Amino acid sequence: SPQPLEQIKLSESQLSGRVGMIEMDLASGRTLTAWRADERFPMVSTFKVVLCGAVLARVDAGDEQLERKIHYRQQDLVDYSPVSEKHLADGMTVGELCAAAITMSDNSAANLLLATVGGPAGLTAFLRQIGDNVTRLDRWATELNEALPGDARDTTTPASMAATLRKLLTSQRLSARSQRQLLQWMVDDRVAGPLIRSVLPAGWFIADKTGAGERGARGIVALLGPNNKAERIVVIYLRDTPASMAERNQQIAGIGAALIEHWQR
Ligand SMILES: OC[C@H]1O[C@H](O[C@H]2[C@H](O)[C@@H](O)[C@H](OCCCCCCC3CCCCC3)O[C@@H]2CO)[C@H](O)[C@@H](O)[C@@H]1O
Ligand SMILES: *C(=O)/C=C/N[C@@H](C(=O)O)[C@](C)(Cn1ccnn1)[SH](=O)=O
Q1: Distances from the Cα of 86 to the Cαs of 91, 95, 100, 112, in angstroms?
Q2: DSSP β-bridge partners for residue 225
């Protein structure tokens, strides 16, 4: 594989779309690679990680409990609720809802949680409170993936997202237990995690949340590193490409391969 920046360029050339990327040391925030890092990209399902960071902040403040059971109705379900559709009779705890939203990208679970933090506006205000003045959530779970060109709704930038994830995971804004919980949910991703491990060389750590939307929108926020350590945060978004999902996946994997082959920078 070529150097990371050269692979990123090749990916835009092959997809006819924009790639947004940031590679950052998780412990210190050192930015290693930055491409279109201040440009807007649809967050798609990656917003679910920030969502649960806001929920954990409420738990830390004593305004929420991960144990609290939420009972909902069938009428509350939206498109793609693999976990939540199974608990109409018994409900789900807030913690279970975050596990379902992050590890299975359960949309009804995300919407139920979103309501607890004040909706899209409430989540955006939480982002503003931790110092992210760019990322914005404007719509609910199954409408935020539209990705209209020029539409600023439901977008983030690679730099903003990376900084925000680092803040949630390591800045002590969240309690030690909450930081550990957010990390574990990402480690537990069932949608892309196992697949990524199957193609990663032995010794590489992976935790992640992926997403996809219209007009080729694709995204992944992840922790990656050799020696089984979450050494760096890597955020990659793709937008406005007519490419098949398989090729968008292949290009992202290619950027990952370039990082792996040229790690010491
Ligand atoms: O020299 C380094 C490595 O080179 C190859 O590994 C390949 C691997 O066989 C391939 O499957 C993967 O594809 C990349 C898979 C990445 C999947 C997604 C990664 C995510 C993680 C974070 C966000 C962006 C992408 O590339 C590596 C590096 O070339 C060799 O097979 C391996 O033995 C060797 O240790
Ligand atoms: C978040 O990015 C969600 C994207 N796609 C979801 C969805 O829109 O609800 C589906 C269900 C694909 N999917 C399943 C699990 N993760 N993504 S839709 O694109 O089929």
Answers
A1: 9, 16, 12, 15
A2: 205
Residue type, 254: G
Q: If you take atom 1 of ligand 2, which residue's CA is the nearest one?
A: 45
Ligand 1 pocket residue status of 195, Cβ below 6 Å: no
Residue by residue, DSSP assigns 148-205 as -TT--TTEE-HHHHHHHHHHHHHSSSS-HHHHHHHHHHHHT-SSSHHHHHHHSPTT-E
Please state which CATH class domain 1-265 belongs to: alpha beta
CA of 200, nearest ligand number = 1
Protein residue with least CA distance to atom 14, ligand 1: 257
What's the rounded Cα separation, in Å, for the pair 14 and 11?
A: 5
| Specified resolution (Å) | 1.8
Domain residue extents for the chain: 1-265
DSSP class per residue in 197-220: HHHSPTT-EEEEEEEE-STT-EEE
Q: Is 84 in the pocket of ligand 2 (CB under 6 A)?
A: no
Looking up tokens 């139920």 gives 112
Is any ligand 1 atom within 6 A of the Cβ of residue 62? no
